[PDB]
Design a protein around this ligand. Structure first.
Ligand SMILES: Nc1nc2c(ncn2[C@@H]2O[C@H](COP(=O)(O)OP(=O)(O)OP(=O)(O)O)[C@@H](O)[C@H]2O)c(=O)[nH]1
Ligand SMILES: Nc1nc2c(ncn2[C@@H]2O[C@H](COP(=O)(O)OP(=O)(O)OP(=O)(O)O)[C@@H](O)[C@H]2O)c(=O)[nH]1
Ligand SMILES: Nc1nc2c(ncn2[C@@H]2O[C@H](COP(=O)(O)OP(=O)(O)O)[C@@H](O)[C@H]2O)c(=O)[nH]1
Ligand SMILES: Nc1nc2c(ncn2[C@@H]2O[C@H](COP(=O)(O)OP(=O)(O)O)[C@@H](O)[C@H]2O)c(=O)[nH]1
Ligand SMILES: [Mg+2]
Ligand SMILES: [Mg+2]
Lengths: 428, 428, 135, 48, 431, 428
């Protein structure tokens, strides 16, 4: 009844889709063979007339080399085969091919799947978009897919958990280009867009979890922990139940500013749990810790326009109000004047779940923080520098203008960042 | 999906093509009989990138062997892995080529071309979604340079969308197999600039050093060098054929590499390479690989990158490994030795990885880098050309085939504008 | 087609309660002249003599003000609301594009049977026709 | 020698600036908008 | 009392009649040898003195090569051999041969057999005509048969399921001529026509059934399913029974516009069935989906004028009503203004039957949607443009003029088709 | 029903009829004693299209062997299947025709026709519903050409409604078996334009290539070419003899191919044809067939399709195959090679299929194409004719038989008109 639709685009979108959908199948006792040995699974599934629970997700991509693994992996009986969409060839780290050449003959094929995937929902909250900004399929198909959604749904809430090009660590040379073009395309079409970088989560894996051989399957396991902690109120009881509609309202001051930060606490090894107590005050303190941010942005250079908190486990409301009061007494944290408020809160009586073979520790308190800081103008600016740096010689452009783009879409997409940059200062 | 088709033009092309197919056939575990006798299902998954099913479960290569002087097509037919090719895909000519670019490109080429294009289309339609062509040339002789580029200047008009490589073996500055060698080079370069998307340059000299310094080999035979070339050609398509936590199709590797449509002359290097003595002292770690590949010794072309400035680079790793370690390593390189890298390209590396190593190893790597030191090659050949061309030495051979003298100046100046593009873009 | 207000049962007939979140088509209800102009108002009466404007076979008989090229929904004006899904006899990344066919020419024409292979020549003598087809 | 002495930087910039955007897939042609959709064609007259 | 007569002309006619009758015998428990181990078979069969149920069909053709396969097959004890009608020579893909030269020798025996077959009938509902437009026999002989049937009965109702010449996939070169000729001939005589295309059903078999190599028999299985769904209400109980006259009246608005599309849902594989739920809303959405149309027409290039739906199995009228209301509220479905109504719905308690060794999956709900849209103007324009391109040069015309025709028949047919497409334009235009 | 009577005029006619009746006999499992010894009943169902039941269960063909110089008929009476023919269907003449069209058409022909026609009627009324006639020729000689056409112009009046086929073996300049060929060619063609419904033109040239290149035969004897001609003649009447999911009788194959009453010259080719060495690299699929049949090397006439534009085409597949795979292959061709097909015919291929492959294979196909390159066959002949008739060489051998000269201008003009018919419809 409290239903959502989860979309995964590109390789990253699918590489996290394996993580999250391994979590939920575990969080509701769902065997990988569909069935299990109500109103709980109905948020992410569809109990057919006899036994089996089909997930209400859609894995969209162009390279066959990832979706076939899912078709041969253990989670192959799960997905309706028509949901897993895969093409012949990919966009090849090029925004045009994902936006003008290849994307245009598969969107409607995805829409027919999304169409029939929205009707079986009796109460819809909103779409969840997992994106990979910096590639061709994620940045190209994604932006093209959202506009087709905005004309088809318009008012519905579309969230974006868009992984973002890291400052130093980078596995691409053209990723400044297809990132800029992505934002100006999603800026007017996503309702709210969370950000997160692969490097910022690498250090989390270094300091806290103390894993020195980290891989992507060590990061995607950290993202599923966020959303499981974000959509607990949709499927689990607990005081201060909070849905998605009430999430964008008290968090997005202007129609432009919807780029936000994320955090999580605690994040500890299996053994230091036997060295700690994890009081609720300690958690929310470490939640505001810049070192616990999932983006390589520094909040201590800017001010907070809003905050959102999702607690979980053994938490009672007096201490949330007691400890938040303390953080508002601290001075390292600032708030822009025109929001004396700023703390939407949430509780859940279902502690986070642990995965066999995972790296987290069994705990009973946790916090997933989401904030809209004005310091997010710094990570924004570098993309405007490297774009402007390469665009002066117009290197690599003969590829974009070779696949159905012209010079307009470059300056067009470049000014909006300038317009958005001043917007991040007009609020000060 | 992502079908390739492989050309082998000339004695070299027909002699290193033997080794290339003796590497892949072993990698997919198919006996010299052709029948598949491998172990896993990972072989049969993406076999269709290089082969075609036949009755009784036998796979034949989608190769094309063109060469004058049929005295080589008995060798491949008598080699161990020779009984796997189709007897049709053997386009030879009873006439010799005479180490003359003219007759290989003007008379004897011109009648074999259509007899080759009848073949290439018979296996350009056999593909589901063609990825692109790839060739193995040798810019010294007449078969590989005359019929080679002439075949390219035909492929380009029937398949311009697709993507054609070039593993061109170039002439050597100190070693001179033949005397006319400078002419057959320049007149062939003037073809690659307009009808090739990518072109790696290989020289027998760096092939001789790596065979003497690293491998410490006593008698480097030609059948041993081609074990190096065939090692890197198989190292490109590892993403096409096997899963990987960061896969990279062949197309996305070109756009991230050539900023402008002309600077498609690359530089390769394979790792790890070690004698049978130092297999006792070596550790199989990622910092070992990335140290050996960035060295100025693995550069299979005899140009020293410490004289130029890397525009971009690449790395194709194989073997279950950590995807952060491979990113922080390549991150350090740009920061320590920050002079050999250009300024108007902020992040000028790309890094892929595949879960499946070579058959006999556990970890490997592969390097591609588009440097500006590559102009030292095109300087050398342009000194010997303008030396003997100034006096019309050995010219009556070329003009007897209907050629003229402008065909030389064009091909020469078209090397001069090219040798300055690499210079003006190299701002120290 | 229009949707006339079913007054007491007009609730539970919005698009939402019918599990349709797709920006409901309201013109089918707004072309009507209801009192309040919305789904819940009652409509208006008529005199009811009901002239004709059309002869037996359709084809609006007189100069009746009509919109041309309706019932067609032309491509130049089809908002992204309307869109088609391509079907099999058409190339697309989802279904496989099976193999095609071309004609491969006879070979190199000669005075004997045409062959694909080029051979040496004993009598060169530029511009002369001498071969040894029999080998 | 015949060295060009042109600024390849500016040349490539201008070429990228003034270029055709590329090839886009055209929409499937509609037969409802065939010019003769309503009326009898011409050649039928001369055939009669 | 509820009895119909079936006519399978041409090759594809009997090719699909074989599937329809293998369906009916299995559905009613009739062994291939006529008899089984009332009012349920009487729609399609007739009981002899003891046990034998002979079908009330007719298989008409001009090539012995297929009627003899039928005569030698296992389904040889069924038919009265006088029903299986064959000729010595064929029409050779020639409308003139099928109409003027060859078919006029066997119309006499076909008509007297139809007379003897309708005599035993008490209450006759109508004539089903399974035809394949594009081949000389099918086209010309069906035109001739329909003219004779209209002059004989007139008051009876003729449905014609016509496999229509396809846009691109075509096993012929002259078919743009005989398609126009057959249309101009039968238009005045058929009471309703259901169009369906081999390309569209190929695409359906590709995308839904996961079959990649259908040998003309999967298409026939699908057509048999469609007719079984359509004629259920004649021989099976259930709320909202619907018969032939009710079917045609509220669906054919003008004497000219009587060609209509078709669809079916669900149509899935034995594993997607087991891994899906197939509620009635999903079924109706899939039915109204364009990619389920059995003809190569895109309904989004037009506006619906009426629709007919036949639900089968576990279906409830409130759910039917809610799904139709949802379809109405939707924005991608258009309707020509002068029909504020537009849906004739019927229900049957009998779920669709499955065949041994078949390819569909056992389901409990199914829908056969049949709509009359103003988008078939596009297929008529295609056919007319092809006829035009060819007849501009008088290509192949010597065959038709030698086999007993003249030139004026091409001009009459082309002007009739021009008028028909102008109709489909005008009657949809709104004030 | 649909009986067929078969003529074999001339030495060639009497020689390919020996293979044809040996091919078909094996296909219907009848011994050279005429007794049926097959396995299935599909050999008995439509046997009456070629044979007549006799006493004791003998099946005697509906053949007619006419020739001068009876020295050939003791050969067919000597072969293994030579005992099956009715000895009274053996019309021989004691004298010869001396490679002269006139006496084979005026003097000696007119003395056997009175008898030959009593033979053809004896077995035209033995049929309930006669389908049509079919003949085999050799347009070079006098017996085959002369009496061939003289017999035809007698059939055209006694049976104008029925259909007449013609497997004429056109002469060729490359194999100049004799000298007076061009006179004997046109004088016969002038009889084929008016008195023939279809005329397949076959050449000894392309009959030799397939043996040297495709079949790779060592010593191709006429006993092997007849094994190629006899293949297509059996490939035609499959739908007449055997069932098929899409049958196609003899008449509908004409109307679907010949738009204007003159262009009854076709072009054939049989598939599949492999060496004994390539049976190892070949797959038995439809796409293999549909590529070899469209390949211009297989066309049994020496007219290159790559110069003309196909008016119409055909394909008669055999074997229990899938009809979708054949309905789209014949479709994919015209879409790709759009220039080689005329535009005033939208879909210009007819496709048949039969469930009964040949006696040894599982799948087989047969091709018929009406191209505008068939003029090249008539250009060469009309050149050698006008080269010698301009001087009136060898003419006294034709006039001596009463012939006039005006028959040598009508026979050439009627050709040069026919050669222009095939160019109007070739818009280049
Ligand atoms: N958190 C996380 N990020 C990933 C993962 N895999 C790749 N990324 C990052 O996603 C970005 C590119 O990923 P892709 O999905 O391949 O890009 P794309 O949209 O598919 O574009 P194409 O590769 O051309 O098809 C890079 O920045 C990666 O570092 C993963 O498994 N987890
Ligand atoms: N759905 C379906 N279509 C078929 C089938 N067989 C043939 N068709 C189509 O019907 C058309 C030809 O109709 P035919 O009946 O074979 O020709 P005809 O009417 O008998 O005329 P003649 O061949 O001259 O006797 C072609 O377009 C076929 O694609 C079948 O079994 N199923
Ligand atoms: N790596 C490698 N290089 C070769 C080999 N054979 C020849 N080359 C080089 O090929 C150059 C001449 O080209 P070649 O292929 O031999 O004659 P062509 O057919 O006219 O091109 C010479 O410089 C040889 O050194 C080989 O087997 N392996
Ligand atoms: N394919 C084929 N052609 C033949 C054969 N025998 C003769 N020909 C040709 O027949 C031509 C001469 O005609 P021929 O039948 O020998 O003398 P005719 O009796 O006057 O017609 C020559 O071009 C021969 O090459 C044969 O057995 N097979
Ligand atoms: Mg990607
Ligand atoms: Mg037929």
């Amino acid at each position: 009844m409290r239903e959502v639709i989860s979309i995964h685009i590109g390789q990253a979108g699918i590489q996290v889709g394996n993580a999250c959908w391994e979590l939920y199948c575990l969080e509701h006792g769902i065997q990988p063979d569909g069935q299990m040995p109500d109103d709980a699974f109905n948020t992410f599934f569809s109990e057919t007339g006899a036994g089996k629970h089909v997930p209400r997700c859609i894995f969209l991509d162009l390279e066959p080399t990832v979706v076939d693994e899912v078709r041969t992996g253990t989670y192959r009986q799960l997905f309706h085969p028509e949901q897993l969409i895969s093409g012949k060839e990919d966009a090849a780290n090029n925004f045009a091919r994902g936006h003008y050449t290849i994307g245009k003959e598969i969107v409607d094929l995805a829409l027919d799947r999304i169409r029939k995937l929205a009707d079986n929902c009796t109460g819809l909250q909103g779409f969840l978009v997992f994106n990979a900004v910096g590639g061709g399929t994620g940045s190209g198909l994604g932006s093209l897919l959202l506009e087709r959604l905005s004309v088809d749904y318009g008012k519905k809430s579309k969230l974006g958990f868009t992984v973002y090009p890291s400052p130093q660590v980078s596995t691409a040379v053209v990723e400044p280009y297809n990132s800029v073009l992505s934002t100006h395309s999603l800026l007017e079409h996503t309702d709210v867009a969370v950000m997160l970088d692969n490097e910022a989560i690498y250090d989390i894996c270094r300091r806290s979890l103390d894993i020195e051989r980290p891989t992507y399957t060590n990061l995607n396991r950290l993202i599923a922990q966020v959303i499981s902690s974000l959509t607990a109120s949709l499927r689990f009881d607990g005081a201060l139940n909070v849905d998605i509609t009430e999430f964008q309202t008290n968090l997005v001051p202007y129609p432009r500013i919807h780029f936000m930060l994320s955090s999580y606490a605690p994040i500890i090894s299996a053994e230091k749990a036997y060295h700690e107590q994890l009081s609720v005050a300690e958690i929310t303190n470490a939640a505001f810790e810049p070192a616990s941010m999932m983006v390589k942005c520094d909040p201590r250079h800017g001010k907070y326009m809003a905050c959102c908190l999702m607690y979980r486990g053994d938490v009672v409301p007096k201490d949330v109000n007691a400890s938040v009061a303390t953080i508002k007494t601290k001075r390292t944290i600032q708030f822009v004047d025109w929001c004396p408020t700023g703390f939407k809160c949430g509780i859940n009586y279902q502690p986070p779940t642990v995965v066999p073979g995972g790296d987290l520790a069994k705990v009973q308190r946790a916090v997933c923080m989401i904030s809209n800081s004005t310091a997010i103008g710094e990570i924004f600016s570098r993309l405007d520098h490297k774009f402007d740096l390469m665009y002066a010689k117009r290197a690599f452009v003969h590829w974009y203008v070779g696949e159905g783009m012209e010079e307009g879409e470059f300056s067009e997409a470049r000014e909006d960042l300038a317009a958005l940059e001043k917007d991040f200062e007009e609020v000060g | 999906m992502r079908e390739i088709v492989h050309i082998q033009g000339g004695q070299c092309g027909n002699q290193i093509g033997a080794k290339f197919w003796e590497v892949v056939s072993d990698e997919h575990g198919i006996d010299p009989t052709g029948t598949y006798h491998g172990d896993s299902d990972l072989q049969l998954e993406r076999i269709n990138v290089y082969f075609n099913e036949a009755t009784g479960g036998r796979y034949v290569p989608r190769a094309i062997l063109m060469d004058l002087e049929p005295g080589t097509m008995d060798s491949v037919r008598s080699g161990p892995y020779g009984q796997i090719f189709r007897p049709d895909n053997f386009v030879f000519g009873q006439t010799g080529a005479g180490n003359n670019w003219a007759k290989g490109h003007y008379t004897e080429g011109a009648e074999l071309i259509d007899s080759v294009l009848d073949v290439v289309r018979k296996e350009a339609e056999s593909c589901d979604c063609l990825q692109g062509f790839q060739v193995c040339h040798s810019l010294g002789g007449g078969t590989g340079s005359g019929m080679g580029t002439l075949l390219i200047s035909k492929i380009r008009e029937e398949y311009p969308d697709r993507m054609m490589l070039t593993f061109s073996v170039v002439p050597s500055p100190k070693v001179s197999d033949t005397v006319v060698e400078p002419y057959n080079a320049t007149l062939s370069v003037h073809q690659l600039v307009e009808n090739a998307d990518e072109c790696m340059v290989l020289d027998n000299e760096a092939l001789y050093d790596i065979c003497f310094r690293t491998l410490k080999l006593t008698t480097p035979t030609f059948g041993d060098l081609n074990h190096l070339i065939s090692a890197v050609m198989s190292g490109i398509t590892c993403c096409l054929r096997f899963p990987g936590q960061l896969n990279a199709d062949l197309r996305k590797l070109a756009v991230n590499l050539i900023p402008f449509p002309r600077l498609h002359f690359f530089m390769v290097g394979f790792t790890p390479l070690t004698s049978r003595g130092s297999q006792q002292y070596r550790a199989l770690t990622v910092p070992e690989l990335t140290q050996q590949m960035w060295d100025a010794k693995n550069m299979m072309c005899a140009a020293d990158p410490r004289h130029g400035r890397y525009l971009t680079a690449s790395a194709l790793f194989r073997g279950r490994m950590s995807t952060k370690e491979v990113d922080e390593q390549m991150l350090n390189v740009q920061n320590k030795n920050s002079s050999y890298f250009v300024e108007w390209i902020p992040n000028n590396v790309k890094s892929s990885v595949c879960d499946i190593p070579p058959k006999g190893l556990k970890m490997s790597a592969t390097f591609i880098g588009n440097s500006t030191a590559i102009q030292e090659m095109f300087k050398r050949v342009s000194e010997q050309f303008t030396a003997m061309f100034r006096r019309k030495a050995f010219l009556h051979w070329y003009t007897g085939e209907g050629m003229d003298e402008m065909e030389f100046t064009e091909a020469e100046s078209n090397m001069n504008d090219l040798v300055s593009e690499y210079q003006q873009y190299q701002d120290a | 087609s229009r949707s006339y207000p079913g007054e007491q049962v007009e609730h539970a007939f919005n698009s939402k309660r019918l599990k349709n979140w797709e920006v409901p088509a309201v013109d089918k209800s707004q072309a009507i002249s209801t009192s309040t102009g919305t789904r819940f108002g009652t409509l208006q009466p008529r005199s009811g003599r009901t002239q004709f404007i059309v002869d037996d076979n359709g084809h609006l008989k007189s100069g009746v003000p009509k919109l041309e090229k309706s019932a067609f929904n032309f491509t130049q004006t089809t908002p992204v609301f309307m869109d088609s899904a391509p079907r099999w006899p058409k190339e697309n990344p989802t279904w496989p594009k099976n193999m095609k066919a071309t004609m491969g020419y006879k070979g190199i024409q000669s005075n004997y049977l045409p062959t694909n292979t080029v051979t040496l020549k004993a009598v060169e003598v530029p511009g002369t026709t001498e071969r040894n087809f029999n080998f | 020698g015949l060295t060009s002495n042109k600024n390849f930087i500016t040349a490539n910039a201008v070429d990228v600036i003034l270029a055709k955007p590329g090839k886009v897939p055209q929409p499937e042609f509609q037969w409802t908008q065939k010019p003769d959709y309503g009326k009898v064609p011409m050649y039928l007259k001369r055939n009669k």
